[PDB]
Amino acid sequence: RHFTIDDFEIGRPLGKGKFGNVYLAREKKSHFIVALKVLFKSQIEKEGVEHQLRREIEIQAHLHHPNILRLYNYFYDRRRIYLILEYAPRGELYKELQKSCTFDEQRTATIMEELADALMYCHGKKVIHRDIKPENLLLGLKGELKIADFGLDYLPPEMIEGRMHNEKVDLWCIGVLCYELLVGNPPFESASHNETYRRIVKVDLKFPASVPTGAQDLISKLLRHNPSERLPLAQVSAHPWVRANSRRVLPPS
Amino acid sequence: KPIPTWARGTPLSQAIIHQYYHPPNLLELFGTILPLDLEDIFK
Ligand SMILES: Cc1cc(Nc2cc(N3CCN(C)CC3)nc(Sc3ccc(NC(=O)C4CC4)cc3)n2)[nH]n1
DSSP states (O other), rough: OOOGGGEEEEEEEEBBBTTTTTEEEEEEEOOEEEEEEEEEEHHHHHHHHHHHHHHHHHHOOOOOOTTTEEEEEEEOSSSEEEEEEEOOOOOOOOHHHHHHHOOOOHHHHHHHHHHHHHHHHHTTOOOOOOOOOOOGGOOOTTSSEEEEEOOOOOHHHHHHHHHHHOTTTOOHHHHHHHHHHHHSOOOOOOOSSHHHHHHHTTTTOOOOTTTTTTHHHHHHHHHHSSSGSSHHHHHHHHHHHHHHHHHOOOOOO | OOOOOOGGGHHHHHHHHHHHHHHHHHHHHHHHOOOOSTTTTOO
């Protein structure tokens, strides 16, 4: 039930500062390995995000899925808030994409099946959006995707609790990810912001020779200016390309 | 910082696989996530 910093053993830092204060730890009593993230109240008070966090924790609280990084519990002292989180042995996806340069059909299709199920799960649990930028994606022991997500009078509570992202923002981000996995960079990258924005709004999508027909079809169906035209999650996990190339592993979850 | 044996190299890896094939009861080990008490925290 209750917890203190005194019942964990630190192994090493994980972020290199990139992801804040994050640590490989195990609980002294069980030798169960978690990832422990320390949040300074001074950084929270400052950015005024105390209600996001409250609510974020309530979101994670009942989010049990093998492709969603698990929050086990939390605790706090006079100055810090500690999150007891699932440890993803293969670390960040974006590093594995560098080692790989690009991902084959199977790896990329597998990741599209894992995302599509993670997000469908989330809708069925009244959580209508999740942040999918490649920064937020971790890899399980057997390579499996692990989505890791943290970060006046007329303002409604949803604005104060951070919950303002639309359902169809992710469908777009799925397209972007799929492309970047196969090509090794995002579809609208450019020398400048001005040029990138113009490319994003004009959806100036161009497929190189290294993207198989089946992916082009999926990606083209996700990356639509009009959000109503974007391919639903249910159809993303049912896409022929995705289904043919997906070799997805499951843990004893 | 010196890095404990358990957290380094191989013995880490084994600890992870065991853990992966022996998913324990999480309700036991951790409990019930309580609502975050914003005031009994920032005051
Ligand atoms: C929180 C967390 C972190 C992990 N696992 C890892 C593992 C890892 N590794 C370092 C590189 N080798 C290949 C071993 C694996 N590197 C990072 S570097 C890193 C650190 C933090 C985050 N993300 C967050 O802290 C989000 C939750 C707030 C992503 C990557 N994170 N599991 N769970």
